[PDB]
Design an enzyme around this catalytic site. Structure first.
Site, PDB file in Angstrom:
ATOM      1  N   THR H   1       1.031  -1.063   0.186  1.00 14.23           N
ATOM      2  CA  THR H   1      -0.125  -0.071  -0.055  1.00 14.23           C
ATOM      3  C   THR H   1       0.886   1.229  -0.006  1.00 14.23           C
ATOM      4  OG1 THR H   1      -1.902  -1.447   1.043  1.00 14.23           O
ATOM      5  CG2 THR H   1      -1.926   0.969   1.194  1.00 14.23           C
ATOM      6  N   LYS H  33      -7.690   4.835   3.240  1.00 15.99           N
ATOM      7  CA  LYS H  33      -6.739   4.584   4.136  1.00 15.99           C
ATOM      8  C   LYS H  33      -6.414   5.876   4.573  1.00 15.99           C
ATOM      9  CE  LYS H  33      -4.905   0.979   1.306  1.00 15.99           C
ATOM     10  NZ  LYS H  33      -3.842   0.351   0.622  1.00 15.99           N
ATOM     11  N   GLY H  45      -3.386   9.003   7.852  1.00 16.55           N
ATOM     12  CA  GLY H  45      -3.214   7.863   6.872  1.00 16.55           C
ATOM     13  C   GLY H  45      -2.648   6.866   7.474  1.00 16.55           C
ATOM     14  N   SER H 119       4.603  -0.287   1.486  1.00 16.92           N
ATOM     15  CA  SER H 119       5.410  -1.001   0.655  1.00 16.92           C
ATOM     16  C   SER H 119       6.057  -0.312  -0.373  1.00 16.92           C
ATOM     17  CB  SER H 119       4.572  -2.491   0.240  1.00 16.92           C
ATOM     18  OG  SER H 119       3.400  -1.999  -0.743  1.00 16.92           O
TER      19      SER H 119
END
Lengths: 169, 169, 169, 169, 169, 169, 169, 169, 169, 169, 169, 169
Positions: H1, H33, H45, H119
């Site tokens: 994400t 998110k 977030g 990631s």
């Protein structure tokens, strides 16, 4: 390692760092990872072991003469000759095209002739892509700036630069 | 990361880099790994997770007040309170002594009050030991020069510096 | 193992330890890892298996005669003959240059003709670099002192020394 | 690490090196691995982490007072209290007996009150057993000579010594 | 297994155990690991597979005749003929010298002509070194006593002995 | 699999089970693991894959003719020819000697010419050794009784028998 | 380790070796693995860590008193009390029955009151079973002879014996 | 994400993708998110499991009220309350500061208030850093463009966007 | 990657994505994975390395001419020629049949001439099978819609399409 | 995969399922695993990769002609070739015999000409053996019923059948 | 292990082998794995450790009384009391129903009251299912015949039988 | 295992297979993986161990009463109580919403209220998505048809169905 290639406005460059890492230690910081070939109208950059990649040079520089100096064909032919215990990546570009030659023997045409290979490859790709789509910078300015950011982020990439540029039409 | 402590001629310093590494990527390059404590006559440096080490600070700064500000006792007492998981290293020094406080709850007195902990610890130890035994450099000059060499060699150590010095008799 | 090479003031040396390790045990502690070649105006040190490196000696000493005694060319030629993967490292120096010859068949010119290879290499590099940049010590004094520190730090390096020096202009 | 204990002619000693190893590097070379306890008529040596073993000290020194100063019982009682996340070995001896206290909570009576534990344990055992059965050397001479040989052979054992002797009837 | 060689006072011996281990089971306990060669003025001991080592015998015994009976040259020549890996070790000795011939094709001169190879090698080395430096025992007595200790300590070494001695000047 | 060989009073036998196991299932229960060779004055038993072992038969039966019918030499020669992707064990016996020929190419002379190889080998060895040293049973009675016990204990050995006997002087 | 129990003609014995192994090295060779309990009309042998098994002793010797001296019930009750971080095996026998008490808390009645547990268990079972079914030897002779064979074959079993016998009706 | 935060010219934004990945498959592509807190003058977030992060929200939103709405203190207090089985990252920003709150309970101030976690974090960091230092783009334009590049490169980041902006002074 | 082939009503198509993945990063998103052969009356798609699959093309296109243009025979012959270090899958179709040619050298006839190979293969198979059995969509519509769903689900499949159709009787 | 062969009353059959499994997914469900050979008086079934087994067909069908049509020989010859990085099982039967030809190059005669190979082999063997020994069903009925049960139990076997029967005397 | 249960014509049986396996060796061959409960109108069989399963007996036999003797009742209640987690399987049957009680605390109603659990479970299921659907054999005959086949196939199942039958309406 | 949920036209269904797999064998084929709750106006399906999921049922059914019958809240509350994690997935739907409740304690709202979880989940998602976007089939028809395709493709999913439907506005 990080090798970047940008093409813009009749220019194409290849930039690489100089870091050689063994474990967590730096063996050498001034490795030359970018050279000129074929009477200096072909530029190339490598990522990996200095031997396997140097094998690829001669093996590729051979196919260049063996095939007129035609970049694409010389690379494609080589894809067969490596299809064996080498692990290296090769970035190759001339006036006409730009490609990547990998270990398994693949030949890859990057999306917008933007090449970013090595451990720090993806970070340089991100910076380059950004600069490309939002500035009017030169192919040399973009590649250099992308390489610095990659060296700032990748533990395995430094701030020693080797840059080869190619002016054409 | 790398933390160095050198003591020489009524001076003692602690120097640390600023690199925070996640995988092979740099999260942050300006981490403050060295601080002052106890009315600024105690200096400390840490290596490890920012949390566990910050736990150790308060836990140690507490014992300092709780024990007069006697460096050695405060550290020794803490060795019991952690004897429970925390993975961090702590370099602590004052006018009197210099010690390392580790994760298992050990307290270690370095050989010549020379402390070099972290991933790049050993490389800084080699540089410091050399300078110590072969120059007339100051404790601050030695620690700084050893930290640069460590940053040059360790992939996990950079060239951001935080240095705290302590002048006494 | 640790091999160090320092060049300073018309002198160049190579120093190596003598430890041979099998598992966690010392097989031998007086290995000769440094020799002279080509009528004793070429010095060399090796790191790795006694066999593979001894192969490299003859293979290299051959190319020396085969190429006049020209250090650089003899090494470069050898890079092709090994390009069959032996796992040893070779430190080679004369009046003119100093190089490393590796397993993959690479030939490397160290930054300031400072060579530090082996398990204990990086630690000797740190000590040497320090002494170089902050003392007026001789190339022999620096290499020896760097080797001791390496042996002190590296579990795989001892305090047996073999040193070969070369005086010139 | 090596800890040796030899008993001969109303004497008993414990000898230990001083090496602390992290990876392949020496963190510290002057670790005190042997101490006196219980008004200095009990000697002990440890192998392992400085914390877990120091836990064992107090935990053992406690049981000594708690049980009169009876060596064997104090150790046996401790075997229950550790029967939990510690990894260390303990060599303990007095006028009466000599034992090893291990991590799982076992208490072991060595064959001829000859104790050799640590990474370099077996090598010291071999040297000690030899000297015992073929010389008239003192328990202190044997332990010291065995420890040197172990340090010579074990990569993880050095030549720093801490020796505690105990004279009795 | 364990092979020991000791040289002292115009005598040289080689001793070996008899254990052959498959997994954790003993296949055979009376293996002959030591023999005489070249009209019984050369002795040899081996460690490893019965085949590969027996290859080495003939291959070595050949070079002995092929080279006059000169121990060192015959071994050195063999180092080239094995330069595959065979996996065995060979201990060879005569009136003049004592050497080890390994799998990679190395030839090693032990420090004081003391040879201890095999799984139990280091333990025998420790016992032998002790006896050598602290007793007046004969080369045969030392080798035998060192082999027993190794068999006592090594799980893979037993108490079956084959000893070959060589008297000279 | 269990193959047993016993020699007693001018008789020698080889006995083997008949179980072939794939995973946890029995593929076949009547495998013939023992045969006669060389005009039926040589007996052999095998353990392992039916292919690799059958390779060994011909390869061995060849060397028998190739070498007069001399058991030991024929086996020793074979040790070189397999010194390559086979995994099987071979038990071979005649009027003169009894040996084991293994995968690595080793040739092993069992202690009292008692051979027990296979998964159930050690159990048959224990039963055989017992009977040998405490009864006056025949070599055939011992081998058969030891094989039954091995089949009773080993999950991978059954109660199908193939026995070949050899009467001589 | 190897513990054997044989019952024959109003006799029952338990025999055990003395080897304690750490890695591939022998810590101790004279471990007492067999004792008497409950006014010396109950015999027991153990295999495993000295601690966990000694726990089992007291824990079992307790249930013996707590249950009249009834062997079977005392063991069955214990099966619930251990149904927790122990790893050891217990061989227990009296005038009436013989059982095994394991780590999971199982209680096992061996087939013919023949018990063989430990690493070398199966080998002793094979030898014992052979002697039982083919000789008229005593329970003590069988157990002792089976233990020797097990020690000969198991790397982890030696030839030190502790034997406890029990005569009854 | 991928979660990005950029601050520029009295604006601060947080942008996140919407991909939820299970193995190699996309469970959901429109995950939210990024949210607003504390009367919509705080934006946040998250990266990680939907649960653990949602825990962090309430746990953080609590501390906000509990501490006046002071961003930094509320986060620092929370660092203690989590100093336990959660694995998520939190990006938090207001008019005054911007921080990251991690799993171990650390609170991190990014270098130039540039946050890139997840990631695909590093790729967004490279694009953002580029745009920041070479364009005059708005904080919203930079964050959005960096998120797209991250989604193009990261296999675990998509092109669904949730963006929350904060205008102040 | 994902290659789909559907045949319906005198039409047959092959559709493929364009994603090339290295680790978790996208190297290229516009790979051409579907082509025409043999005067454009044969269509083919590949999954795997660009090299190995391109080998297969020529190797297959060869056999086509070498065998009249007979699809099945040309593929079957190739099955022998690859029966060697290639890892790729090949989807091949014409007017008459449709097959898969795999790495081991297998030739597979799909159940209803429905081909779905690659990482996202099974997902496209599920979507295609659904559409086939429940709609009246064209072979081109089905393949394209199945490929989108696969790209939506597979992390390793994108939404770049290359589609080749073949109209016949 | 499940291949069954039953012989009874001048009939012999081979039955196989049709499942081809990739990971946990069914690629194809109607694979033809049973065929006729040699003018349809030889039947064969295979288990494994479609390629390697198809290799075996031709390689076996060749030896059939090459040897007359004599079953054993054609299969035995084939045991050579597969005897080369490969894996496939072959069930072969005619009027005279029934055999299995495996990957290592073994040829196996099943106990009562009952063949059950593949992942589901053992389950079919169990059902077949039952029916054989307790009914008067035909070889075709038995094989079919055993195959269904195997498909019911084996996750890797389905209910698609291919059955080839052979009537003779 | 192997436990079978078959119900047919107002009869229900449970059959089990007697093999207890430790590693590759048989500890015991006459284990009683099937018993009667609750005044002998409930039968049960177990697979696993003798302890954990015996726990389950009492724990289950308890719930039987605690719940009237209602089979299904007593088993579902137990599912909560086990929700340790220790490893055994339980097969339980009476006049009314037949169930399996597993380690996690599940209760499972087999398809046709056919229960086959243990390592050899699936093989017995295959044989039983065959006999059920193709013979008129009794529940006792089927279970016994299925258990033999399982013992023939499973390495971990033998031919010792314990069978308990239950006649009702 | 496959659980599918489709919502369309005031209907919502959940469908699941019945396969329970142990290793590569089917334990049971008629598992009920879908039930009704809360006076039959809430439907649920699970994937995983029968125990852990059944825990989740009660644990969830509890929160339903505890929270009025409000689906979303009851699930959200449960996310805290599970935040020791039973490994199972839960599909839950009513008149208002549809969600997934996972092992880590996450609550996930599927994209179009289309739920596909389990090993065969993605295949059913592909089929369902296809039918949804290209037919006018009912939510029950789509879920059933998608489940069959999943069972056809997933090795771990069968063709036993449990379907619960819910009609509303």
């Amino acid at each position: 390692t990080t090798i970047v290639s940008v093409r813009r406005n009749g220019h194409v460059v290849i930039a690489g760092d100089g870091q050689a890492t063994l474990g967590n230690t730096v063996m050498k910081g001034n490795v030359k990872k970018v050279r000129r070939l074929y009477n200096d109208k072909v530029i190339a950059g490598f990522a990996g072991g200095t031997a396997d990649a140097f094998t690829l040079f001669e093996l590729f520089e051979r196919k260049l003469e063996m095939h007129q100096g035609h970049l694409v064909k010389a690379a494609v032919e080589l894809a067969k000759d490596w299809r064996r215990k080498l692990e290296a990546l090769l970035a190759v570009a001339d006036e006409t095209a730009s490609l990547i030659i990998t270990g398994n023997g693949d030949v890859v045409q990057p999306e917008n002739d933007l090449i970013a290979i090595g451990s720090g490859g993806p970070y340089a790709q991100a910076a380059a892509r950004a600069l490309l789509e939002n500035t009017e910078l030169s192919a040399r300015e973009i590649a250099e700036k992308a390489l610095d950011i990659a060296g700032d982020i990748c533990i395995y990439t430094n701030h020693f630069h080797t840059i080869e540029e190619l002016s054409y039409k």
